[PDB]
Amino acid sequence: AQSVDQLIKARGKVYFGVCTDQNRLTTGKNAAIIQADFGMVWPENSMQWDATEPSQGNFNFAGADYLVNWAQQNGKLIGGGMLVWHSFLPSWVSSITDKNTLTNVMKNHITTLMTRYKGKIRTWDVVGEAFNEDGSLRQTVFLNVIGEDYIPIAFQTARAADPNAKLYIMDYNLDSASYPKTQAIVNRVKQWRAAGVPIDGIGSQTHLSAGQGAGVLQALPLLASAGTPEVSILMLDVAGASPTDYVNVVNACLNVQSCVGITVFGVADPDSVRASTTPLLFDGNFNPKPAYNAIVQDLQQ
Template structure:
């Protein structure tokens, strides 16, 4: 893990070589990551990829304020192995090199997911063949970055809202055994990486989806499936922040070593929602980190809801200011 310097919690953005005339050059931005780590946590991160890391203003904010990066798209199956046996490493390599140059943790995202899946995978109907496809994909991707990626979202978004298993090529051909296959392949590929199962709408403790996650993870871990953590994405709407604490505590009650908030964004970005959501991780001993899903609203997948901590002009919003105050 990275060491924490408690006495250097602010850095003048003027020193980060931002473009002349940028509003940010006239402000001082504090590191939310350093304050969060000082609370005993491991990282406060965001997502990015080559196009945004090549944007000087965006990169400067991540350098100063955040401690981890998750590839937003470049490690998803349709990007990294669009054709069977042909891997595209350009985007992931760029992100890895940038992160290591700038001292950032990397969360790998994501290995087995029904969405943004290369079309050829959906045509695999034989269980033995699909097992090999999963194992090969994980071995190649995780193997390339072995020892360099801290967390991996191994299985992503496998639950329906009613707690049933989502229909996908993986569940159709292999049933729930695809989970065991994926996690065992991941453990073999990088024994030191923390292996996560990740999903959205795990935002209330008693929802069918949350309970399905907890009950099935307990079952799999008891059977020896190497699941280290549960990730709750936390794509929230306004007013939902107060419910995150109960949900995180419930997930932490599962038979896993740790949990994390992996893709936090909140429609409207109300300060009280962000403070409550982040505090949910601060207060839960098993919660190791928070990642917000982007830097500025313009670049968010939910741009029309203004869900992030920085506005379209890269200015920190009230939610960021209040998070700094809360963590301080």
């Protein structure tokens, strides 16, 4: 019955958030649960590249406008993204082979989305999933055509477009301190910031198997050692939804001063991409699960 967003605010954090979109807000009990329990919303799909720029320079904002308007009406913070990602890319982007062309396409995509919502978006995920598992840079069209400068260019462009937004890089499999990807993103973000690249946060896209929450207690402090002003947990889900794993992720954020909050990947189990693992905090009747109650109790104490 208690609101995890209200309780995490009382502990000095900024939000407990959730991913959603128009399709969810008009079905189930998603809107009522988000109103009650979550302080920030993120677009599942409506701000990805294939949704917003399906043909070059032919932008479609309908889904994204719906979410932003709903969030403002209901007093919720808004996160946006992903601005630069190799998934959900339209084919017209991935066929460009010219550096100047792709650089201008990328800057225009970033600037157009960020200007439309200027001042209304707390956090933008600027670049996502830029690292391979061995810590090398993922060979996406942006890396292949622009070079490693594409990441500085993307963040510099985003800062100019809306200097009020917090700018994040995001990746998954950052859940263990000794994993090569964890080491690499920390080292590269340190170097980028030392050269003045405006990276405000690292977002950890946390998709856990049973028992992996304990590792986050060590991994998240390591991510925070890169020196960004903020870190966060994003797109969180946990196979089996054990209270032990969920409470460990919450405690990791409570233990890390720069952790501003946690976002879960959805509201109810049946709408998960891995629904067979019942990995979310509400069940198929929209009742809170034991893991939700455990987080409430941990935050109350």
